[model samples]
Target: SVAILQKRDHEGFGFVLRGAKAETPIEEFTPTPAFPALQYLESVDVEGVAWKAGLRTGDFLIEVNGVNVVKVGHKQVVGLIRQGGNRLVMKVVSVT
Candidate 1:
């Protein structure tokens, strides 16, 4: 229930937002023998808050809160992150 970026101030989720329409898009993220997930993280900020969450390089971005973000484009995913945040430090939940 804590998902809603209805405000425009930076106090509710920091960082910029993308269109998710700039990166490659996938229709269905089916875990095949080759590809397990649609989109996985490759690199993260070496000196940022994200590092505290154990998100380093080569990690997969599963979802922001509960929305799947693998098949989604890069920019689109950013947009979702913004739309799904209302905190100054956007609550992004990633994998290790």
Candidate 2:
């Protein structure tokens, strides 16, 4: 399922992410083919926008806005989230 989230400027998507390249952007996060579970949700705020929008812990992110994040870097993804301002259109799936 996809989560269409809306957040305040002082707030976050209310979740934690894991498996994204932090130290180096040499490779992308791919639970599909790279053999490593690259990117996925680590946690979620039960009362937060993400949770209300259908996003839960361990959810795998497939896209942000209209961009495919599977091949994108962590830094860029963060930027994209910020770029979305108060609204975020995300495509995610539950892996748990």
Candidate 3:
């Protein structure tokens, strides 16, 4: 299991999913099927930091620290933050 970290308005939220344990590939964690909000990432003011750090606005983050974000749920991400520390080094893909 790996961790996925994402920053929104400088605040981070995350979760964990059982990927390796599952037989099929999981695209994202749907903890609450009624809440579709968890599946999408909204725009934030991290442009300054992201740009300076070599990240673009439309960049879709596929992984964080080499861990697949899709495989790891949001909760696991929180655990990662506690274990790995505050700062994060993410790996993303340009979708623009």
Candidate 4:
């Protein structure tokens, strides 16, 4: 099932998640040059929806759905999520 929540910008929406059991192993993720400021995911609101969905402040957003962020532009990425019915299946590498 898919979930809908608030749309957050670069800074406030920071968080990460590990790959699922059936997924391939993920290594490091490099943030796009256009979004240099987003290289670091500082914190996520623990009381918010991201936390409830098993995300953490330091987790890296390796991929959104199945599209790699490195291949897609930042604005396009945000639009993909905002379009409404897509679930964010991210591959996050923990920093903590």
Model number with the top TM-score = 2
Clashing pairs in 1: 13-87, 13-88, 19-75, 19-76, 20-75, 20-76, 41-59, 41-60, 42-58
Angstrom error of the Cα, residue 63, model 4: value is 1.1
lDDT of 1 by residue, 13-61 (tens): 2222332354667676565434544454455454444444344454455
Model 2 spans with C-alpha error above 4 angstroms:
22-37
Scanning candidate 1 in windows of ten residues, the lowest lDDT window is 11-20
lDDT for each candidate structure: 0.47, 0.74, 0.43, 0.47
Q: Encode model 4's per-residue lDDT on 3-92: one tens digit a residue.
A: 234444443333432222222323354444343223234566776666766666655555556655543444555655555443355555
- List where candidate 1 sits over 4 angstroms from the true fold: 1-25, 32-34, 85-96
Candidate 3, 8-67: lDDT as tens digits: 554443322222333244556543333322222334344344444555444444555555
Tell me model 3's lDDT, rounded to 2 decimals: 0.43
* Full candidate order by TM-score, most accurate first: 2, 1, 4, 3
Taking all chains together, the TM-score of candidate 4 against the true structure is 0.48
User: Residue by residue across 1-96, what tens digits does model 2's lDDT show?
Assistant: 667888988888888877656544555333553233446778989888898887888877778898877756677777887898999988876654
Worst 10 contiguous positions by lDDT, candidate 2: 28-37
Predicted structure 2, TM vs. truth: 0.79
